[PDB]
């Protein structure tokens, strides 16, 4: 889309020295201790996400045994019998957080709150009915 590619880095993470000094004063983090630091903030160089796409490289086209798959799907459907579901109107939707990003285009103009106020319930229902055909 742009004339230049972008390289994204990851920051090393901050250190809370006072807590570590308090813990060390309490006889923690000695040699030969059953507890030790194993969780940290790891930093990354410029090529990080484009290195994660070569992990989506792992997906392969697979043909499944159709008869066994059909029987298995019929059996699996019985673990979801106690539940209920269906479509609801735009009135009944419950959104947890309205301060999250709306995506590729649309992040250049606001958060998800802006696009949920702007459109009324009728517009949302019209979009949903459009998506059905």
């Amino acid at each position: 889309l742009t004339n230049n590619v972008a390289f994204q880095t990851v920051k090393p993470g901050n250190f809370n020295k006072d807590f570590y000094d308090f813990a060390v004063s309490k006889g923690f983090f000695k040699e030969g201790s059953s507890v030790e630091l194993k969780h940290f903030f790891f930093a990354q160089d410029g090529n990080a996400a484009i290195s994660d796409y070569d992990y989506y490289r792992y997906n392969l086209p697979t043909m499944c045994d159709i008869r066994q798959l059909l029987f298995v799907v019929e059996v699996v459907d019985k673990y979801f019998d106690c539940y209920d579901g269906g479509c609801i109107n735009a009135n009944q939707v419950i959104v947890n957080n309205l301060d999250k990003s709306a995506g590729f285009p649309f992040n250049k103009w606001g958060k998800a709150r802006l696009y949920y106020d702007s459109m009324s319930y009728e517009d949302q229902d019209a979009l949903f009915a459009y998506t059905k055909r």
């Binding site: 090393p12 250190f15 040699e31 630091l37 940290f40 790891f42 930093a43 990354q44 160089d45 410029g46």
Partner: protein
């Protein structure tokens, strides 16, 4: 004692990153490799020389005033 080395490596990479080191791709790559590998070490006899290699990076610039900041 290895915890001391890991924590000071974290602090050194933090100050290096905030000195705008990551504006040079390969230097930042080498610093990140050293910092990530020090955190994964299991003996104090390799973390120390990787730590000294990582400190030689900061001792090469001219943004950190050293004589003043080792006021003791």
């Amino acid at each position: 004692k290895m915890s001391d080395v890991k924590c000071t490596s974290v602090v050194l990479l933090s100050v290096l990153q905030q000195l705008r080191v990551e504006s040079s791709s390969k230097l930042w790559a080498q610093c990140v490799q050293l910092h990530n590998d020090i955190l994964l070490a299991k003996d104090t006899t390799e973390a120390f020389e990787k730590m000294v290699s990582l400190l030689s990076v900061l001792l090469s610039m001219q943004g950190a005033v050293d004589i003043n900041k080792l006021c003791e």
